[PDB]
Amino acid sequence: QQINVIIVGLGIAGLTAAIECHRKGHKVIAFEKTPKMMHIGDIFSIGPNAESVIRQWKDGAISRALNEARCAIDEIKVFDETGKLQNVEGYVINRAEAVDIFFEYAQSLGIDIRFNSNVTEYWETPHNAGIIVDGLKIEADCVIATDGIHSKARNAICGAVVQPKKTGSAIYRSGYAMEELRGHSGAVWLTEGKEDVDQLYHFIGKDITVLVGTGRRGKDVYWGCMHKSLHDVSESWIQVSDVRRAIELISDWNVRDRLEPIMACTPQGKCFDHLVMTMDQLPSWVSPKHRMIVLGDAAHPFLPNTGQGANQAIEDGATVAICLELAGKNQVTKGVQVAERLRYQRVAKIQELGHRMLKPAWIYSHDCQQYAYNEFQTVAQLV
Ligand SMILES: Cc1cc2nc3c(=O)[nH]c(=O)nc-3n(C[C@H](O)[C@H](O)[C@H](O)COP(=O)(O)OP(=O)(O)OC[C@H]3O[C@@H](n4cnc5c(N)ncnc54)[C@H](O)[C@@H]3O)c2cc1C
C-alpha cells in the first residue's frame, strides 16, 4: 500500500520532495543528471515560509546547519560607481552549502538516490508512471519532475512551446574561498572587515551593478555583475566566461581599483555567465493521466528580485508529499492534481510581483504544510 515515487532532479525542490515524501512514508527513487554532487551556486535566500518545513527535520539540526553556513550579514553598504550612498526575516546562504546540507541529510535517511542519470523520456498508464534511464524503464505510482528552469520534463509533460524568456539582463558571477583573496592589497577593504560577521556591498552604475559579499564569517567570497546584454548566448547555469568580461564592464569605474582584484582572483579566471530569465505561466504542471507533475523552477521560475526560487521549491516539495499521503496509493492521481491546484495561484502571484517590481507577509507568513492539510479535501472535491 506504500506509494512509490520517482523524483527527477536533485536541486532544492527535488531534495525537499525526496525528504518529505520519505517522511510521509512513501518509497522514493531519485535521479540526478550530474555524476556527483557538484557544489555550484550563488547566494540565495531562505525565508520563514521555507524554514517552517526545514526546522522539523532532525529536531532542527538541519536548520542549525543552514544557520551556521549562512552569510551572517549585519548591513548592506550601497555605493555608486565612485562613492558611498546608503547603509541598511529570511537568511542568506550559498546555494552550494544548502543543497549539500539537504543532500547529506536525504542520503542519510536511506533514500535510493542515483547520479549520472540524465532523464528525458517520461511515460504513464492509468495505473503507473515512470521514466527511461540509461535505456532502462523505471516504474512507480507517480513522477515528480524538479529538473530546473531548463527542464526536459516540462518539454515532455507540458510541451515545448512555452520556454524560458530572456529579460535583457545577464550576470557574471563566481564564488571562492577567502584565502584566494587574502594578501592582495587591493582587497584589504573586504578582507580586513569586521570578523565573525559577513559584509555585503552593492556598487550601482548606469545599467551595471556589481555585488560583492562574504559568507560563513569571512571564509567565502562571492561577487556578481549584472548588466544589460540582449545577445548573451548562455543556455545553462554552468556556462562560463573569462572574468575579463566583468572587469571590462567596470573599466571606467572609479571603484574599479577595489572591484578588479575580487574578480581577477577568481580561480582559473573563469566566472559563470547566466541570463536573467522569466517564463510564462504554464497551462498545467500535470500530465494527461495525472501521475506526473513538474515543480520548482521547472514549473515556475521567478525573477531573482523576488528571492523566492528556493523558498517555493521547498514549499512545492512539502506540499506534494502531503498530497500523496492524504490521497493514498489508490488515489495518486487525485493527490497529484490537488498539489497542482494548491500551489498554482500562489506561485503565479509571486511571479507577477516580480514583474511588478521589474517595472510581503502574504508570502513569508504562509504555512504551506498546514494549508495543504486544511485545504486538501476541499480541493480534492473540486478536482
Ligand atoms: C548548478 C546550478 C547553479 C545555479 N545557480 C544559480 C544562480 O547563480 N542563481 C540563481 O538565482 N539560481 C541558480 N540556480 C537555480 C536555483 O537553485 C533555483 O532557482 C532554486 O533555488 C531551486 O530550484 P529547483 O530545485 O526547482 O531547480 P534547480 O536548483 O535548478 O535543480 C534542478 C536539478 O535537476 C537536475 N537536472 C536537470 N536536468 C536533468 C535531467 N534531464 N535529468 C536529471 N536531472 C536533471 C540539475 O542537475 C539540478 O540538480 C542554480 C541551479 C543549479 C542546478
Residue numbers in the entry: 19 to 106, 116 to 386, 408 to 431
The authors write:
Herein, we report the identification of a distinct FPMO, CtdE, that stereoselectively catalyzes the 3S-spirooxindole formation in the 21R-citrinadin A biosynthesis. To gain insights into the mechanism of the stereoselective spirocyclization catalyzed by CtdE, the X-ray crystal structures of CtdE–FAD and CtdE–FAD-3 complexes were solved by molecular replacement, and refined to 2.1 and 1.9 Å resolution, respectively. CtdE comprises two domains, a three-layer ββα sandwich domain for FAD binding, and an internal substrate-binding domain featuring eight antiparallel β-sheets. We proposed that 3 may undergo a 2,3-β-face epoxidation as the first key step catalyzed by CtdE and followed by the regioselective opening of the epoxide ring that triggers the semipinacol rearrangement to form the 3S-spirooxindole 5.
The cofactor FAD was co-purified with CtdE without exogenous supplement during the protein purification and crystallization steps. In the CtdE–FAD complex, the FAD exists in the “out” conformation, in which the isoalloxazine moiety is away from the substrate-binding site, similar to that seen in PhqK24. Similar to the “mobile flavin” in para-hydroxybenzoate hydroxylase study, the “out” conformation could enable flavin reduction and substrate releasing, while the “in” conformation places flavin adjacent to the substrate and performs oxidation reactions. The CtdE–FAD complex features an open substrate loading channel, allowing the substrate to access the active site, whereas this substrate loading channel closed after substrate binding in the CtdE–FAD-3 structure. The FAD in its “out” and “in” conformations displays drastic changes in its interactions with surrounding residues. The residue R122 forms different hydrogen bonds with the hydroxy groups of flavin in the “out” and the “in” conformations, and is conserved in FPMOs PhzS (R106), HpxO (R103), and TropB (R124). Superimposing the CtdE–FAD complex onto the CtdE–FAD-3 revealed that the residues R122, R200, H229, L238, M253, and T333 move closer to 3 upon substrate binding. In addition, the polar residues D60 and Y249 move away from the substrate, which may provide a hydrophobic environment for substrate binding.
